Design a protein around this nucleic acid. Structure first.
Lengths: 63, 124, 145
RNA sequence: GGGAGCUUGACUGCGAGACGGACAUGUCGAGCAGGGACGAAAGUCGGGACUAGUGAUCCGGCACCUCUGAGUGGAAGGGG
RNA sequence: GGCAGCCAACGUGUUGGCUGGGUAGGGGAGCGUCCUGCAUCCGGUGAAGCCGCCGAGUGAUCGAGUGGUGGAGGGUGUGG
RNA sequence: AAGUCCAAGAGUGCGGCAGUGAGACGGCGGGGGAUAAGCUCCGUGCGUCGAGAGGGAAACAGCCCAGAUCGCCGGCUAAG
RNA sequence: CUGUGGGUAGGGGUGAAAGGCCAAUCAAACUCCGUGAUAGCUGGUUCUCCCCGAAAUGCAUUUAGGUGCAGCGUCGCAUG
RNA sequence: CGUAGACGGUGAGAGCCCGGUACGUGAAAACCCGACGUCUGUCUUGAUGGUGUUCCCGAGUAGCAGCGGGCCCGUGGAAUCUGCUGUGAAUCUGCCGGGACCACCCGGUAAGCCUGAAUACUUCCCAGUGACCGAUAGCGGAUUAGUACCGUGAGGGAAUGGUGAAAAGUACCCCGGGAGGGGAGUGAAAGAGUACCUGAAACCGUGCGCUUACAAUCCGUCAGAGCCCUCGACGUGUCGUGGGGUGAUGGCGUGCCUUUUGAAGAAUGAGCCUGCGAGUCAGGGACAUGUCGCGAGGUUAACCCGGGUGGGGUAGCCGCAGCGAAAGCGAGUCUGAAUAGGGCGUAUCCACACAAGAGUGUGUGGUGUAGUGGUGUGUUCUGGACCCGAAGCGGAGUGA
RNA sequence: AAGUGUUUAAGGGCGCAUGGUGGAUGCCUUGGCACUGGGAGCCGAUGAAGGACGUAGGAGGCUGCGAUAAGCCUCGGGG
């Protein structure tokens, strides 16, 4: 039985060239009128997964 | 590869039963009940082996105190005087002298009394 | 000689199995599981986080699409070309595969900035600007085929 | 804090550096476009005196885009 | 006096000196059992098993030491 | 700045493989209670028990002394 | 009231109605199978020794006796 | 000497004793596949390769609509396939598919069609094999076994192997009603007597040694008086480096396990012994830790051949690169109307320059980057997944 | 004159010896389990699968076989 990858984790996380798992940031989907553009710029782009969550996110991506 | 565990089990069972040989009741017959007592037996052996030194020192001290007071001196002042005189005879052999060589014990008592200060209670 | 009884594993090769739950002198009783709980009798799923929105559900799904028609290329660098063909000569997909620079059946894209110093007739599916510049400076010929 | 002018820093759109606080949150120097004030005078001042005034993800909209377009001369059918 | 990591040594690195209560738990190293590749030993001049004696090892445990019963297998080494 | 000097078995980062996420009492600083509870809830590079034997507290997890590598017909002490 | 022979069968029967009875079992009989149901809950989990050695906290939680992460235990890096 | 040492049996390890084994080989009859016959339709009776314009040629079907099913596709933009309901196409300028459509097109010719062998499984039969079990195991079943027994029924469902080489199975006598014994005999052995290989523990006796009826005991442990045997000085009982027991008496001493803040706990479990009873296995699964091969390469999967574990097998997989949502380059890329300003990447590490003290950059040279396949162990994934345990749920039946 | 003083075991404990019960252990096997390679892959109104009752000189079970009843005929093999 092949280890199935977690669909949600695969859709929410990516690995860079060096293997860094990257993710997008929450609170940037709607309710944006009250959010200053500095906040949305902070929430923009991709950030490396926190070391605490890295183990479980790797588990979900690999199997 | 089915393995029957009698050969391996009976080894420790015989060990514990032979060790508990002499125990009263189930403790000498049943391995499980012998094992409980064997735990206690060996814990007690360790504890009493540590405490045997204190028990024998207590016996020696009691005998030395008896001999000292027979010689008209307390045990504490006898030890103080022996230390002042530099006599390094342990309490074991002090009790051995007290029993087997009372004359030698009296000589040591005289040495200790001579080495004691002129006034044991002096502020010195 | 070496007979069968002279064969032994490499030092540090084999390791004893951790036979758990065999007396208290080893990982006994609970077998490394500790006292009561879920984990005392089963494995907690990796995606479970105690009931709070898991990370893989509170984080937004990555933006974009995958483009099932993407034309990805197997890349060759002119530095690898130099190492593989110090004398020069014609270069194409066949001999790139032979030298082990690309997959056997793929669209090869040549490229590079690693000081191409050999006249080479390189025939790949595509080239980069620096690939063409390096080929020309070295005196070779880039051909997209 | 209280009044006044500007005419819309109503300073917005692209934002190295640093940081404070697990995700989330929060601070701003500074560079560029465009402007607002003040101009002589400087070249200076990134929502509200500051901390609450909010709700992840999913799923859907709605505007714009140099993206995609399941053979395509090509379009319609998804994304940013 | 006996046993368990690091340090110095000059040379084959095994000697000396600085070191250890433990539940969950982690790491290391082992005892015993069975089945097996190969090697080699013991066995109706008595295998195993069992009951002892005498002992032995830091532990699991040991017994190519030994007596009794027994009647056909077993030990050791290195691997699986 | 030094001190700890055969390092603390130190701190940090990354991968270990975890269990733990019911704590208890005692001293100090407090909340609730009646400034009761062997009460309850906090803080304490505070302790101990948990997970800690040994000695003293008559007995007596949490107090006091003191952290058990093993032996000894040794010695000195701790609290008492 | 009774004998004999019949009929009604399980979410169904029968019930002068008590959830009564339906083979000593009934708020949904029994047997087999799904099936080794599932249980964050109890219980059990078997040889040894050497080294180290916790936690009972924070945040979150359809969460509060569960769990995720962090804190705290366990080899190799850098560090002297 | 064996072209036959496979495996068994035979009074204990047998190639040469026997059944056999390698291999001299064998079928009347019956049943299975081969060659030649009788037997079975189509032609020479002008087709057959070329010529050419025009007419005719597979239906309640395709399509469509509603409601469903199934496809990665859970109704979605929803194609292809399909059930039911309704409505319903011509003849190649047709029709259908390419996940709408002009069509540039390509592919194919459904519904009237139908029809082939080459891959799964084993009740049964034959020959074999096992780092499978070996009588609580292995099938429930080595034994009356689906039997006994239980249940009205469906159904549930056991326990029970070993004398010896050979019954040689103990004649005869004695005690006894017998049973059971004692002589005697058989036997290598009755320390093999149809209660029978060995014969453990629990449990139950009998004999001997010490001890114990003034004593308060987690039943032990440390001292320890008193009561027998192994070598000798000495010559004879008191010593010893010596060597086991029994335990008057004294000190200390609160079972084990689980679970707890904490249990000797008057919390849980255990009457005892023996046997059994719980982290195991599958998979190129996933994540981390020694070895082959490289040199950027590692590997094969299915499969083929081999009487094996061996040889082939490049499909694929992983490395080989990245940034991007994609289009784009390449150590670059993305964001950016703004050679304006940043993230992710260019292994790593040295040196020399230019910018910098906002703490380090930008170039230049030099070392050239290490992943991969087996098997290493620990975790983890999907499976019951360390083991045991519900009440209850469903399907099919059995019961008045 | 006072004081000292071994000496019993109804029973029990411990140990050793010697037995019984029991059926563990060891060594086995007539039996299972998992497979491999082949055969055959259907039987039945010409009465199947499966049975009840019978059947041998003698009681019953299993086996075989059906009033032709541990059996009848033919053809082969073997001695």
């Amino acid at each position: 039985p092949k280890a199935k990858t977690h669909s949600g984790a695969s859709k929410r996380f990516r690995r860079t060239g060096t293997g860094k798992i990257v993710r997008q940031k929450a609170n940037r989907r709607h309710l944006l009128e009250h959010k200053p553009t500095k906040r949305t710029r902070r929430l923009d782009g991709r950030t490396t997964v926190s070391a605490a969550d890295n183990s479980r996110i790797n588990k979900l991506l690999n199997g | 590869a089915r393995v029957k565990r009698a050969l391996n089990a009976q080894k420790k069972r015989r060990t514990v039963l032979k060790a508990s040989k002499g125990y009263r009741g189930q403790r000498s017959r049943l391995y499980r009940k012998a094992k409980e007592q064997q735990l206690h037996s060996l814990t007690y052996a360790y504890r009493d082996r540590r405490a045997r030194k204190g028990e024998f020192r207590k016996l020696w001290i009691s005998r030395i105190n008896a001999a000292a007071r027979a010689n008209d001196i307390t045990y504490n002042r006898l030890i103080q005087g022996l230390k002042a005189a530099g006599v390094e005879v342990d309490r074991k052999n002090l009790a051995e002298l007290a029993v087997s060589d009372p004359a030698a014990f009296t000589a040591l008592v005289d040495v200790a009394r001579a080495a004691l200060p002129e006034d044991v209670n002096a502020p010195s | 000689v070496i007979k069968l009884h002279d064969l032994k594993p490499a030092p540090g090769e084999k390791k004893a199995k951790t036979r758990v739950g065999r007396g208290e002198g080893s990982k006994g009783k609970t077998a490394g599981r500790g006292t009561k709980g879920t984990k005392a009798r089963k494995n907690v799923p990796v995606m479970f986080e105690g009931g709070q929105m898991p990370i893989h559900m509170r984080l937004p799904k990555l933006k974009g699409f995958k483009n099932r028609f993407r034309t990805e290329y197997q890349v060759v660098n002119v530095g690898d070309i130099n190492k593989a063909f110090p004398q020069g000569g014609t270069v194409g997909v066949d001999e790139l595969v032979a030298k082990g620079l690309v997959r056997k059946n793929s669209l090869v894209k040549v490229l590079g900035d690693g000081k191409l110093t050999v006249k080479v007739d390189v025939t790949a599916n595509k080239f980069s600007g620096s690939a063409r510049e390096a080929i020309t400076a070295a005196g070779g010929s880039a051909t997209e085929l």
